[PDB]
Design a protein around this ligand. Sequence first.
Ligand code: HEM
Ligand code: HEM
Ligand code: A1CN2
Ligand code: A1CN2
Ligand code: H4B
Ligand code: H4B
Ligand code: CA
Ligand code: CA
Ligand code: CL
Ligand code: CL
Ligand code: GD
Ligand code: GD
Ligand code: ZN
Lengths: 402, 399
Amino acid sequence: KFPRVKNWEVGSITYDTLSAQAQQDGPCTPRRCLGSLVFPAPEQLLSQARDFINQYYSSIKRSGSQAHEQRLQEVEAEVAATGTYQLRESELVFGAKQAWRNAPRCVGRIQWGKLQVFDARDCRSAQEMFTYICNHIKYATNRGNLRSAITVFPQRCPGRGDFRIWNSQLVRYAGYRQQDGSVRGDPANVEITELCIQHGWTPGNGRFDVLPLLLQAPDEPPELFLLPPELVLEVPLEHPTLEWFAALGLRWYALPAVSNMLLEIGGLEFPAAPFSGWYMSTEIGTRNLCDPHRYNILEDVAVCMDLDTRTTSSLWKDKAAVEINVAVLHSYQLAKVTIVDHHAATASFMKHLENEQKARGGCPADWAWIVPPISGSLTPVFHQEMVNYFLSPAFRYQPDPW
Amino acid sequence: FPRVKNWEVGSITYDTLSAQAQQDGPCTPRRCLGSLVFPEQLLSQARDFINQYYSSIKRSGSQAHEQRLQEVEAEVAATGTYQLRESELVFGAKQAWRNAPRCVGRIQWGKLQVFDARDCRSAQEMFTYICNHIKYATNRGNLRSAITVFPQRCPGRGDFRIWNSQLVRYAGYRQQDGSVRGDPANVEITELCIQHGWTPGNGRFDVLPLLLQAPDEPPELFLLPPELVLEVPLEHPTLEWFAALGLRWYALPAVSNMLLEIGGLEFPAAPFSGWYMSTEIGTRNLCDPHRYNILEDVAVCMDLDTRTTSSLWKDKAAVEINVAVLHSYQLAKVTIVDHHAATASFMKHLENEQKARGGCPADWAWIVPPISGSLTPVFHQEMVNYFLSPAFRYQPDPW
Ligand code: HEM
Ligand code: HEM
Ligand SMILES: Cc1cc(N)nc(COc2cc(CCN(C)C)cc(F)c2F)c1
Ligand SMILES: Cc1cc(N)nc(COc2cc(CCN(C)C)cc(F)c2F)c1
Ligand SMILES: C[C@H](O)[C@H](O)[C@H]1CNc2nc(N)[nH]c(=O)c2N1
Ligand SMILES: C[C@H](O)[C@H](O)[C@H]1CNc2nc(N)[nH]c(=O)c2N1
Ligand SMILES: [Ca+2]
Ligand SMILES: [Ca+2]
Ligand SMILES: [Cl-]
Ligand SMILES: [Cl-]
Ligand SMILES: [Gd]
Ligand SMILES: [Gd]
Ligand SMILES: [Zn+2]
């Protein structure tokens, strides 16, 4: 049999048949589960390529056609001659969508079919790379009506270095390692900040300074490019009823654009391929502003709210964190920037799981990452058993280039 | 040896104890299933537990050690099973708690009152042992941990089984509109009680009778005297209408349907109890959609905007229900603990166990509280889950 999966809210029971097609192995064994850990050749390339091609031809309802036979024979010939092959434009668009669709830790996959794919495979310098990224930022921001996008730079090939974007996201705020061990800014960005300074950037002293980009073109040190300020839409934060909240000086940016993951399609690897969507408010409200090792504002909000912070049993932390989340959502809706709260987000993911059960017979989901960081059991994904496994195409983590 | 990181702090440790995992869990390299709720060779298991026991008391390979080994050998040669000494039984009971991966309260594991009930026959004796337990553990609101071990399983004989999933359960009555009045979780046991001859109440908080089962007999209904079942009426420190909703819960969480395993012995009835973490009552029992599901009622009462999700009315209402649970238990002087204090104590347990055994089996999904996840330190702690023995285990229903 296949793993039987159960929804404890409704009683319903599914079987995940898709999980049998899992190739690459994860970190668990029958002796011990490591699900909570954040970070866990001509003939193998051929079998990956064959699998991907079969996938494309299934998607377009054409499996076994003449064009399917021929494209498989085409790919086989190019690998035999060059050791690699090239994706057709239509295969790249399909592959980027499949990689998103396959990402077990993404709760926003109800959208996986509405992804704009920018083909940058003919890029040949850091300067051209920057222009592709600004065009992406502009397209995806769209003055606050966010559109999902991905730009795909050239694939890894033997005898030439990779394109890399050094920044983990296109928009990040500086983190200045202060002298008393502290940090002014986003602590998560202290390393990439010190790297920007070392590469010529004149730093500021704010807590919300936008970092420039370090772009690495093949076989060359990274180059610094400053984003034009009019390109980075930002939301100042205010509370619908806590007027002093505005005085806190809080901002976040509109566009979540992950730039450091590797995209893998049919055996081919794209080291630089930034992708963006829109934010779920709990990423900003709970994790980015309340994580103790981030901006860590939970106590200061609670004190201002005049909460009794001397005993945990008053639940001051939970009260302040709710209200920080209200402010984020209210602020994005005020400035007409797309945003979704963790109730709608998780309820649309329940809709995605059910589409996927029908479409494919399963859905890779990492329960610990799909359940939001506040109000977990209040969302319906909490009560949904999930099966976690690796399908390809895929987005994968990769080493820092320095 | 799995590297385990804490992300708020940056500390690394190594779990060397996972190597001692005796049994197998549900996960494989192809797929992780940790989110799933329910995933004469007796000599080998008995020998291992003994080596454990004597190592724990610093008397390994000594005289008493080898004496007990040949003792159990001959006991199973003569009988087919063997008897635990009272001290080993105490030790196994504590170890099985200490090894429970889904329990956040294990900071307490050394302090547990073990009541030996292996000399029990008939359900009326069962019932007497059980009321002594409730009396000892409740202790007028100052709660104390306790377990009562009933006769082990042996060949050719029935088992002792407590049919109720807990010693204290509220009725769930199916209604002609389909819905349930009372606790929907308990609909199945509530008809079993009515079938074996219980007079149904009709409130949302009617305490069920006990369906106790002595070997090779049908179960017998027993009613708990109301003065023994201590209950907390729920009120809110500042929202004066909350009291009128009539919500209540009980004081003693007493699980009565898990099987206890020690040195290859199996105890199908060994009820244990502790005290409650507030979120168990406030969030899961009163607010799960398939339990009392009171969240919208409370939101309406708070005049929140319940027609749009982004007002976070579900979150604001949930917090205030937890606030009322905490305030009501403390006011009535019943032991309770909030999820912040509980998760910080589990962090201390992790450090202590890192030093005592080199690791600690922990099931992240059940350690992290169901509200305010990332607001507690366990959210940022990587965790390894595996099955040591002695253990507590789920087991099929008695029917
Ligand atoms: C359009 C709305 C989207 C929403 C609301 C959304 C939401 C999220 C959230 C909340 C996470 C977990 C983030 C974390 O805590 O680390 C996540 C992870 C992820 N998302 Fe999505 N996302 C969206 C679009 C996209 C797109 C367009 C892609 C790729 C084409 C994508 C790919 C991924 C991947 C690969 C991860 C896993 C990385 C990790 O471990 O954090 N998402 N997403
Ligand atoms: C004394 C304070 C205690 C606290 C605060 C506490 C807390 C908890 C909580 C919150 C859970 C998760 C329950 C759930 O929602 O599924 C749990 C599970 C568990 N606890 Fe504890 N507990 C305590 C005492 C005990 C004792 C005395 C024992 C046995 C001697 C024990 C053994 C277990 C076991 C076996 C589980 C697993 C049950 C399951 O899978 O749900 N606990 N505990
Ligand atoms: C496209 C997109 C949309 C969206 N709404 N959210 C995301 C979040 O994606 C990531 C976020 C982090 C930050 C780590 N987190 C603990 C704060 C690390 C990653 F590797 C990610 F892929 C991506
Ligand atoms: C001794 C003790 C103390 C304590 N504070 N909490 C517990 C909770 O124990 C269990 C709870 C559930 C219900 C799981 N969820 C529906 C709430 C199922 C089980 F099998 C359990 F053992 C036990
Ligand atoms: C240790 C733990 O696995 C880790 O903190 C995970 C848990 N779940 C998460 N879930 C999301 N969405 N994002 C995260 O960063 C994490 N962190
Ligand atoms: C599907 C998921 O495994 C299931 O809902 C689990 C998750 N975490 C939990 N955590 C606790 N404390 N209690 C539970 O019942 C559960 N249920
Ligand atoms: Ca070609
Ligand atoms: Ca009818
Ligand atoms: Cl982010
Ligand atoms: Cl309970
Ligand atoms: Gd105000
Ligand atoms: Gd009113
Ligand atoms: Zn696992």
